[PDB]
Amino acid sequence: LHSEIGRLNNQSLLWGPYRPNIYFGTRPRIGKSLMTGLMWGKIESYTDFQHTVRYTCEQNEGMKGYGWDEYDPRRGGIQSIHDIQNGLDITTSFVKIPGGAHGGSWAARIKGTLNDDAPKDQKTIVVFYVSQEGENSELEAVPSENEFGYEGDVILKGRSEALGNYKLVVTKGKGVIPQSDHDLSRLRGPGQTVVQSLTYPDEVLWQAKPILFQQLKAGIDWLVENKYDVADPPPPWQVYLLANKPGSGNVHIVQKVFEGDFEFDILFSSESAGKEVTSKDLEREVKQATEVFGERFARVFDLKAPFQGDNYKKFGKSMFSNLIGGIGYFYGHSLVDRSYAPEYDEENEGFWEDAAEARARHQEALEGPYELFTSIPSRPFFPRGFLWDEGFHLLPIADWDIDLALEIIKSWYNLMDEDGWIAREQILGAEARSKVPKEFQTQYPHYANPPTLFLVLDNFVERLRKLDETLSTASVDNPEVGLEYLRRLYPLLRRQFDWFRKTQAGDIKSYDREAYSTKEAYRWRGRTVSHCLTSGLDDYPRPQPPHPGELHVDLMSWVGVMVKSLISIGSLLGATEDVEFYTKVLDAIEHNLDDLHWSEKEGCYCDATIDEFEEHKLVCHKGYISLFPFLTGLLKPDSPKLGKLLALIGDESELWSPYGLRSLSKKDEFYGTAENYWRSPVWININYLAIVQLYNIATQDGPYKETARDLYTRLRKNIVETVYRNWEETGFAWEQYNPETGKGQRTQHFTGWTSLVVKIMSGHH
Numbered sequence: 066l067h068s069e070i071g072r073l074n075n076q077s078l079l080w081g082p083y084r085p086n087i088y089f090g091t092r093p094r095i096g097k098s099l100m101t102g103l104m105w106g107k108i109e110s111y112t113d114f115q116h117t118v119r120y121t122c123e124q125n126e127g128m129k130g131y132g133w134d135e136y137d138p139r140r141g142g143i144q145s146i147h148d149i150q151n152g153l154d155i156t157t158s159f160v161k162i163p164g165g166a167h168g169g170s171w172a173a174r175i176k177g178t179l180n181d182d183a184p185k186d187q188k189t190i191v192v193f194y195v196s197q198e199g200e201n202s203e204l205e206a207v208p209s210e211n212e213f214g215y216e217g218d219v220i221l222k223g224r225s226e227a228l229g230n231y232k233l234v235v236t237k238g239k240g241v242i243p244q245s246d247h248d249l250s251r252l253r254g255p256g257q258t259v260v261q262s263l264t265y266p267d268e269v270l271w272q273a274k275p276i277l278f279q280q281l282k283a284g285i286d287w288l289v290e291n292k293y294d295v296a297d298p299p300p301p302w303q304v305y306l307l308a309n310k311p312g313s314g315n316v317h318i319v320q321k322v323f324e325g326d327f328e329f330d331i332l333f334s335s336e337s338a339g340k341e342v343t344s345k346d347l348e349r350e351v352k353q354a355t356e357v358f359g360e361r362f363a364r365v366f367d368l369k370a371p372f373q374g375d376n377y378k379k380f381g382k383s384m385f386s387n388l389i390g391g392i393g394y395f396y397g398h399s400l401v402d403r404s405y406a407p408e409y410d411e412e413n414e415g416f417w418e419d420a421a422e423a424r425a426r427h428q429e430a431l432e433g434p435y436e437l438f439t440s441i442p443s444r445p446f447f448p449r450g451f452l453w454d455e456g457f458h459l460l461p462i463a464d465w466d467i468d469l470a471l472e473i474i475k476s477w478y479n480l481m482d483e484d485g486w487i488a489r490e491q492i493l494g495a496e497a498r499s500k501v502p503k504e505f506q507t508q509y510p511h512y513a514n515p516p517t518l519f520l521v522l523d524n525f526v527e528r529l530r531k532l533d534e535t536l537s538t539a540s541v542d543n544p545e546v547g548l549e550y551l552r553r554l555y556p557l558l559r560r561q562f563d564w565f566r567k568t569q570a571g572d573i574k575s576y577d578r579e580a581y582s583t584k585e586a587y588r589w590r591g592r593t594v595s596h597c598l599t600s601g602l603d604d605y606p607r608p609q610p611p612h613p614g615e616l617h618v619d620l621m622s623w624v625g626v627m628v629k630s631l632i633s634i635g636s637l638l639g640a641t642e643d644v645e646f647y648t649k650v651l652d653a654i655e656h657n658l659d660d661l662h663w664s665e666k667e668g669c670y671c672d673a674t675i676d677e678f679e680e681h682k683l684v685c686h687k688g689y690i691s692l693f694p695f696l697t698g699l700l701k702p703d704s705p706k707l708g709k710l711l712a713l714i715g716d717e718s719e720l721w722s723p724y725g726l727r728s729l730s731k732k733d734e735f736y737g738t739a740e741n742y743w744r745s746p747v748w749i750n751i752n753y754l755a756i757v758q759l760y761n762i763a764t765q766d767g768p769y770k771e772t773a774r775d776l777y778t779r780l781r782k783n784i785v786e787t788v789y790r791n792w793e794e795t796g797f798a799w800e801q802y803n804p805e806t807g808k809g810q811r812t813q814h815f816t817g818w819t820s821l822v823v824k825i826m827s828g829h830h
């Protein structure tokens with residue numbers, strides 16, 4: 066019944082619009098398979114289309130906004146695109162129809178409406194691009210009856226091992242088709258839907274824009290060669306209409322031109338299922354999925370006061386659909402340095418110059434191929450899996466579909482190498498590499514990242530203790546199933562735990578350092594003079610200079626998080642020998658956190674280093690780092706230290722802004738310095754941890770109950786309203802928020818952990 070729930074899950078989630086890197090496209094969860102993609106662009110001139118065409122997501126003044134209004138990866142959803150440059154408000158409805166043996170069917174409607182600014186007679190080129198990889202697979206455009214292209218629907222017939230037989234139909238659609246009176250129409254038609262079937266080597270099929278353009282260019286070249294010139298040129302839109310040449314191949318370009326508003330449908334029908342999908346099916350299934358989304362939201366994301374209002378409901382729906390709608394399937398090679406150069410051991414003073422020398426050797430090679438099913442921080446900027454990010458992405462996702470969240474966890478944990486390492490950044494394939502500068506591509510086996518994924522596991526454990534509907538919760542409703550999942554994953558958790566202790570170990574025994582345990586001390590590998598990327602807080606101030614004797618209180622607290630999870634799960638599995646080891650370790654971290662990181666002078670936790678005279682010095686920078694033992698739920702509710710941190714959290718002269726907790730205190734000397742990335746701005750993921758922990762303390766007998774309750778109340782209010790106001794004004798979730806103005810800044814479309822705001826509003830932790 067485990068293999069059984071897993072098969073149903075496979076079959077449920079197989080198809081989706083799993084390529085978040087482009088405005089609209091589909092692929093299944095198979096590395097080499099069938100993929101689709103949308104492109105559109107107005108054409109006003111002979112040279113304009115190349116600049117107007119849209120394919121991959123970006124964010125600039127050209128594009129007012131875009132994102133999912135509703136989305137469930139099991140059912141589908143609706144996306145809105147507001148394109149200023151192209152004068153177009155576009156809608157992409159995508160829906161899945163279960164049935165057959167090949168992971169169901171699906172269908173999409175593309176609607177375009179000219180906005181009030183656009184010339185009512187705008188010409189907009191639309192393209193649907195279809196590709197197939199695999200050695201023993203086939204795809205054919207059925208030719209049209211008419212000479213120059215299609216009056217009606219385009220039908221592609223295809224077969225593959227993974228998909229069996231299928232047909233994919235691009236319908237004729239509603240909208241005016243411009244007609245050309247030029248001579249050229251004697252050879253190219255007056256204007257009509259056209260199909261070009263091509264073949265390239267598989268590994269380049271992803272490069273839709275160049276492949277399209279190569280075809281467009283050959284078309285213009287043809288015109289020049291056949292004496293169609295400036296003496297009397299065809300209309301631009303006719304110049305960019307491809308000559309119709311359907312056939313078979315691994316690429317199929319379907320192209321339409323519309324004047325004014327337009328719409329058309331894609332109907333993918335698995336032959337494995339019953340009758341083929343129809344447009345009338347698309348309409349029904351879309352309507353029904355909306356109703357299902359509606360019900361589920363109100364049940365799973367019941368917004369509590371003061372956010373019960375519809376305005377906040379719309380807000381929550383937008384933040385949630387954009388987070389979950391970013392889910393993607395990625396496939397390909399990673400770039401990894403597998404040298405394990407000794408300089409990465411970072412055992413010297415000046416180690417950053419050593420590690421740069423080993424990097425300068427360029428031993429990194431491609432390896433894999435790998436696959437990952439994951440949500441993502443940002444469609445336009447960061448369309449790929451980030452390890453500690455996903456920790457936050459999955460917390461609301463888990464509420465919505467726990468079976469979904471566990472798939473994504475499973476997916477992430479399957480990338481782990483024999484040592485226990487998962488690269489913090491998953492760049493899989495040439496496609497995924499295209500949106501990443503060479504400098505950032507290479508992964509390093511010594512670089513960790515917060516194990517925020519254990520948080521989600523924690524929530525599942527607590528839920529496990531206490532057909533699309535059924536599937537979504539099968540892993541808590543069937544305890545046998547839950548446990549079996551944990552049994553299989555547990556080895557990997559423990560592996561990773563040990564990997565932290567082998568690779569991220571701090572140096573006690575070699576200095577003047579007394580403390581309750583000889584074992585417990587952690588230091589992030591990977592740090593440079595001004596950064597510690599691996600920690601998540603890229604430019605939070607750390608001991609200067611960086612130094613092999615550093616200890617990092619955030620890292621130690623993360624290890625804390627892991628052991629608490631390991632206790633819970635080991636118990637559930639009865640790994641008794643294990644659960645005793647964990648208990649001794651937890652005990653030691655609790656003590657060592659105090660002995661090695663607590664500053665009575667300053668009233669908070671601190672990183673450590675070793676002095677010029679080789680003695681242990683605390684280095685205190687009051688901000689997120691300083692709160693870590695508390696954010697990670699390690700502190701006893703009656704602790705004087707907890708209470709001292711509540712003073713810090715609440716104190717407006719340090720971290721308490723009207724808009725949330727500042728990453729760094731106004732008092733610190735690094736406040737608003739350098740890039741000011743984690744050096745003042747409000748970050749929603751770290752605020753979320755605080756809000757959750759405050760609520761913990763508030764809902765328990767203890768000396769800090771009523772202080773916590775008040776901070777909770779205000780922080781929840783502050784964070785939500787800041788994100789909401791910004792959403793209202795700008796349409797976007799932002800990466801961080803400005804503590805002085807409340808303005809969102811850095812990156813847009815960050816959903817992304819900002820979306821955590823949905824869970825914050827719904828409350829009752």
Ligand SMILES: OC[C@@H]1[C@@H](O)[C@H](O)[C@@H](O)CN1Cc1ccc(CNc2ccc(N3CCOCC3)cc2)cc1
Pocket residue numbers: 442445446447451453454500501502505601602603
């Ligand atoms: O959310 C992810 C991550 C969190 O894990 C961290 O905690 C947080 O501190 C930072 N974030 C975000 C993050 C920030 C920087 C990088 C690398 N720089 C980089 C520079 C330019 C591009 N471009 C892509 C398209 O446009 C032109 C070029 C892309 C990347 C990666 C992620």
Ligand SMILES: *[C@@H]1O[C@H](CO)[C@@H](O)[C@H](O)[C@H]1NC(C)=O
Pocket residue numbers: 075094
């Ligand atoms: C889905 O099923 C196929 C065939 O049974 C299998 O190759 C694949 O591993 C499954 N996908 C995963 C692991 O998500």
